[PDB]
Amino acid sequence: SMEQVAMELRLTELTRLLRSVLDQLQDKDPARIFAQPVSLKEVPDYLDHIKHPMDFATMRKRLEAQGYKNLHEFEEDFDLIIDNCMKYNARDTVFYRAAVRLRDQGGVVLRQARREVDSIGLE
């Protein structure tokens, strides 16, 4: 149907905006601490601690499959990256501190992303 095509165009449009958002967020992680999933070979107990692992590569996979239907779902995954890190790692670690900086700098990006999604009407 034509309605279904229109819905798909909106989703494709949203996916384009989120790709830009994702790139901007990942630029705030120049150490690439959050670029890939935590290795279960190198951190064998990880899933005992963290029940829903997340990372930028995994987000990018979901994004390219147009698997984010709205900005809230995207934000949920970004928050998992930060929140998982701040639980597994202690305050005095480079990992925890990197997550704090990513959350702070990323907030700016997400604030305007929300305005753009609402304004253009992409969800």
Side-chain angles (χ1 to χ4, degrees), residues 58-60 62-68 70-72:
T58 300
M59 291 190 64
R60 198 170 293 278
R62 181 165 168 188
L63 179 71
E64 288 309 320
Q66 301 191 337
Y68 294 113
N70 55 59
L71 174 60
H72 180 78

Side-chain angles (χ1 to χ4, degrees), residues 81-100:
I81 293 178
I82 303 303
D83 294 341
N84 288 345
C85 184
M86 293 177 68
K87 291 176 191 64
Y88 190 82
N89 301 286
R91 277 194 297 286
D92 66 340
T93 64
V94 58
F95 306 108
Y96 183 109
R97 286 164 181 274
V100 167

